[PDB]
Structure formats: C-alpha cells, structure tokens
Amino acid sequence: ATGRTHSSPPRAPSSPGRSR
Amino acid sequence: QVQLVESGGGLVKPGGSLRLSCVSSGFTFSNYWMSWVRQAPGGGLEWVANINQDGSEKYYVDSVKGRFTSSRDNTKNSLFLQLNSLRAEDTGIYYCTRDPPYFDNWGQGTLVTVSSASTKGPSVFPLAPSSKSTSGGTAALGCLVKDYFPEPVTVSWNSGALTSGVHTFPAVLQSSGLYSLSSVVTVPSSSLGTQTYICNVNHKPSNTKVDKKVEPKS
Amino acid sequence: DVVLTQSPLSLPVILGQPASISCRSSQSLVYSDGRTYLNWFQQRPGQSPRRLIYKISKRDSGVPERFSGSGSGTDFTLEISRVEAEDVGIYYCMQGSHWPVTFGQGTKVEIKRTVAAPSVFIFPPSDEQLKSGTASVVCLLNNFYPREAKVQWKVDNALQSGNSQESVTEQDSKDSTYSLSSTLTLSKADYEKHKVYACEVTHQGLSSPVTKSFNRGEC
Ligand SMILES: [Cl-]
Known part of the structure; x- marks a missing residue:
C-alpha cells in the first residue's frame, strides 16, 4: 500500500466537518 | 455486451421541461452508479449528474442544482434525467454513462434544443446530375434537405444500400432560423440510367419521412 | 475545479x-x-x-x-x-x-497528406423548389486536401457576397480528405432575372481557378 488497500473513488463532493 | 440506449430529447421552450431516459442491457444495472454528461454544441464535455446504485444519493453540477433531478428504476434497467427551467445553455447532446469516474460505457447521445422557434419539417429537393458528366467518368448527385427545425435529420441512400461515396454535410443554420443540409453521392456515369437513386430523409421531430428520387433531368 | x-x-x-x-x-x-x-x-x-x-x-x-x-x-x-x-x-x-x-x-x-484537388460540381435549382419561391444553387467540392478553399459565386459575371453559406465535412476516416458544399440563395424573382450561374474555386491542388457554370433554362 502506497495509498489505501482498496479503491474508493470520489463519487460525491467533499463534506468537511466544522462542528463538534 | 453493455448497451446504453437513450431517448427523450427534443425541442423545448426556455423554462420548459423535458425528460431524458436511458435503458440499459447486458449488465447488472443495480451494481453501478450512473452519471449524465452533456456536450454543448461544437463544445467540450461537461459532467452533469451522479446517481448511486439505488437512488438515495444524487449529485449535480452547480449550474443545474434545483433544475435537474436524476432518478432510476432498477427493475426496469432505466435511468432518467428530469430537466426543468431549461436555459439557452442547457442545449447540447446529453450522454448517459456508467460508473463515474471510470465512464467505461456511453449511451449514443440524445439532443436537447432549448429554443422559442417551433418544429417544422424539411423540404427535399433533388440535386440532379449535370448533363455533361464525362462519358466513362464520375457523376455527382444529391439531396437538398431545406428549412427544417430542430435537428437532427438523417439521410440515407437506397435504404442503406448505397454507402460509399456518400457525403452528408453538417446542418447549417440560415438567416431564417431554420436548418439546411445537402447529402451527395458520387456514382459511375454509366449507371445514371441503369440504377435508381432514392434518398431516404428522416426527420423525427416533425415525423417527416421522405423518399425522393434523383434522376437525370430532361 | x-x-x-x-x-x-x-x-x-x-x-x-x-x-x-x-x-x-x-x-x-x-x-x-x-x-x-x-x-x-x-x-x-x-x-x-x-x-x-x-x-x-x-x-x-x-x-x-x-x-x-x-x-x-x-x-x-x-x-x-x-x-x-x-x-x-x-x-x-x-x-x-x-x-x-x-x-x-x-x-x-x-x-x-499529399495535396489533392477538389472535383467541382454545380447543381441548378430544382424545378420543384422554384415552384415555392426560392432558388438554391449548390456548388460541391469533393475529396480535396488541405481544407482551405475559396468558393466565389458569380451571377451574370457579377461577384456575389452575403448570400452563400458554406458547409465542410470532417476529415475522411479513410482517404483523409475534406468535402465542401456552397449554397447560393436567391429569390425566385432574381434567379429568373439572370442567365449564367458560376462558382469559381481556388485551391492549392488547382494551378488555375476551376469554374463550373450553367445557364438557367436546362443550360
Ligand atoms: Cl431514484
């Protein structure tokens, strides 16, 4: 592994966490 | 073998609605995310929509949020795109695609035209071959498909039998807001009396279907 | 993005x-x-x-x-x-x-690819189209290379401008050549008011401009 063991393509926008 | 067959595109006024359909075969439809991708005329590809396997996740490019909704029906092998509040720039070929971001298989495209103008069938006029085509040389004959709206027209020759030598030109928008093209075909001068030449002009928007015979004029 | x-x-x-x-x-x-x-x-x-x-x-x-x-x-x-x-x-x-x-x-x-010369053809208005009120004169350039080509129209030897649209095909997948049509649009009136219709064609494959013409009235 240089990245993650199985692929997980972005099929949805990123939704960061900004709250508790 | 994977097939993506699309339908539902046509002419629609600004602000109107239209519903695109994709029916697939040859694979387990419910295993894939599906995706819509549009191509503005003479233009680049633009991603439009994602929809997950069962329809619970739907994402859209920003220019369309609130106006387009995707949907899918996994028992019918069917993927839809509901277009709403259509704008001048929603014009283009809309493609169904499988499995973003791989996009391994594409539907054949379906054309969406956003316009005030209304449908109109073509006229089909023969371009008859010059009386002075060389004795044992090549003669050119053709079909002028004129004043129609919107696209597409399809032109074939001899019900698909005559195929080589055929040039169907890109439609051209005239000053009257209507489209016009010619379809030509080069054939041996020897056969001009022998062989019959019919151009099959299909224009599905107006349900026009024309078979025009092209013959030496005298 | x-x-x-x-x-x-x-x-x-x-x-x-x-x-x-x-x-x-x-x-x-x-x-x-x-x-x-x-x-x-x-x-x-x-x-x-x-x-x-x-x-x-x-x-x-x-x-x-x-x-x-x-x-x-x-x-x-x-x-x-x-x-x-x-x-x-x-x-x-x-x-x-x-x-x-x-x-x-x-x-x-x-x-x-190598320079290839346009075969020019000209087609008069069909008589079916004259019955409606418009005359399309179609000028065809077949199987040429490179793509650049000038079509000029002449009616009774007067040069025309602003009443012809061009259309050019994509590069052929087999022989790598183009084809171009030029359509001249006139009213029935003006077409019937004139005798000789010519399209002049200049191109690299042509040492001198080819002209094809016809006369109205089965030429
Ligand atoms: Cl759904």
Whole structure:
C-alpha cells in the first residue's frame, strides 16, 4: 500500500466537518 | 455486451421541461452508479449528474442544482434525467454513462434544443446530375434537405444500400432560423440510367419521412 | 475545479508518425485513497466518446496497442506511436480525482497528406423548389486536401457576397480528405432575372481557378 488497500473513488463532493 | 440506449430529447421552450431516459442491457444495472454528461454544441464535455446504485444519493453540477433531478428504476434497467427551467445553455447532446469516474460505457447521445422557434419539417429537393458528366467518368448527385427545425435529420441512400461515396454535410443554420443540409453521392456515369437513386430523409421531430428520387433531368 | 489544459489544440500528423497529446493539470491528481483517476477519450464525428485509457496508463479492451497513457504529478500524456487514418477525431483527457469531474478542452488530430484537388460540381435549382419561391444553387467540392478553399459565386459575371453559406465535412476516416458544399440563395424573382450561374474555386491542388457554370433554362 502506497495509498489505501482498496479503491474508493470520489463519487460525491467533499463534506468537511466544522462542528463538534 | 453493455448497451446504453437513450431517448427523450427534443425541442423545448426556455423554462420548459423535458425528460431524458436511458435503458440499459447486458449488465447488472443495480451494481453501478450512473452519471449524465452533456456536450454543448461544437463544445467540450461537461459532467452533469451522479446517481448511486439505488437512488438515495444524487449529485449535480452547480449550474443545474434545483433544475435537474436524476432518478432510476432498477427493475426496469432505466435511468432518467428530469430537466426543468431549461436555459439557452442547457442545449447540447446529453450522454448517459456508467460508473463515474471510470465512464467505461456511453449511451449514443440524445439532443436537447432549448429554443422559442417551433418544429417544422424539411423540404427535399433533388440535386440532379449535370448533363455533361464525362462519358466513362464520375457523376455527382444529391439531396437538398431545406428549412427544417430542430435537428437532427438523417439521410440515407437506397435504404442503406448505397454507402460509399456518400457525403452528408453538417446542418447549417440560415438567416431564417431554420436548418439546411445537402447529402451527395458520387456514382459511375454509366449507371445514371441503369440504377435508381432514392434518398431516404428522416426527420423525427416533425415525423417527416421522405423518399425522393434523383434522376437525370430532361 | 481542476483545470486540465491540453496541447497542442490541433495536432496535424503525417500518417505513420508518432503523435503526442499533453494534459497539464492545475493540481495534482491523487485522491485521498492514493489513486489517480485520469482517463483519455476519443470522439469521432457524430459519435459518443470512446474510452481509450483509464488510470493514467491502463488501456481498455477494445483499444489498439498504438495508444498509450503515461505521466504523473500534473503532466499527463497520450501517445499514438503510429498514427493511422482512423485516428482522426477529437481526444479528451478527464480527471476524476477531485470533485467535480472535469474534462480537457479536447485536441483534434488531423492527417497531413499529399495535396489533392477538389472535383467541382454545380447543381441548378430544382424545378420543384422554384415552384415555392426560392432558388438554391449548390456548388460541391469533393475529396480535396488541405481544407482551405475559396468558393466565389458569380451571377451574370457579377461577384456575389452575403448570400452563400458554406458547409465542410470532417476529415475522411479513410482517404483523409475534406468535402465542401456552397449554397447560393436567391429569390425566385432574381434567379429568373439572370442567365449564367458560376462558382469559381481556388485551391492549392488547382494551378488555375476551376469554374463550373450553367445557364438557367436546362443550360
Ligand atoms: Cl431514484
């Protein structure tokens, strides 16, 4: 592994966490 | 073998609605995310929509949020795109695609035209071959498909039998807001009396279907 | 969004030669899972995109081996070792590593071939069209190379302007030539008010301008 063991393509926008 | 067959595109006024359909075969439809991708005329590809396997996740490019909704029906092998509040720039070929971001298989495209103008069938006029085509040389004959709206027209020759030598030109928008093209075909001068030449002009928007015979004029 | 910049935007190539398309990303293309989701598409006229390369360098099942992908970081390259005539068309790169999916603006691959001369034909208005009130005079340039060509129209030897539209086909997938039609549009009145209709054609393959003409009234 240089990245993650199985692929997980972005099929949805990123939704960061900004709250508790 | 994977097939993506699309339908539902046509002419629609600004602000109107239209519903695109994709029916697939040859694979387990419910295993894939599906995706819509549009191509503005003479233009680049633009991603439009994602929809997950069962329809619970739907994402859209920003220019369309609130106006387009995707949907899918996994028992019918069917993927839809509901277009709403259509704008001048929603014009283009809309493609169904499988499995973003791989996009391994594409539907054949379906054309969406956003316009005030209304449908109109073509006229089909023969371009008859010059009386002075060389004795044992090549003669050119053709079909002028004129004043129609919107696209597409399809032109074939001899019900698909005559195929080589055929040039169907890109439609051209005239000053009257209507489209016009010619379809030509080069054939041996020897056969001009022998062989019959019919151009099959299909224009599905107006349900026009024309078979025009092209013959030496005298 | 990521911006993918393709170059050159138009790539003329002698048949049988190497040809190389670049794709410079405005961003690295490695998603959080470590993978680079970069694709190449080929699109032929009136056809849907065909996937050639995926994940930078993997070739799809259909695709001939003369096609190959490579690169890392922000430069990626599509590479046709030996160009064939069927390979004319528009090629797109496509990144999927960062939301949302973005395409390059597309590179058109054109064949450089020997100069070929246009065969000119002219067609009078059909008599069926005159019965409605308009006269289309159609001038046809078949199977020529290169693409640039001038069609001038003359009615009773007066040069015309502003009443003819051109249409040019894409580069032929077999012989690599173009074809062009020019249509001259007139009212029934004006067409019947004039005798001789000519389209003059200048082109590299023509040492002197070819003119085809007819006279109204079965010529
Ligand atoms: Cl749904």
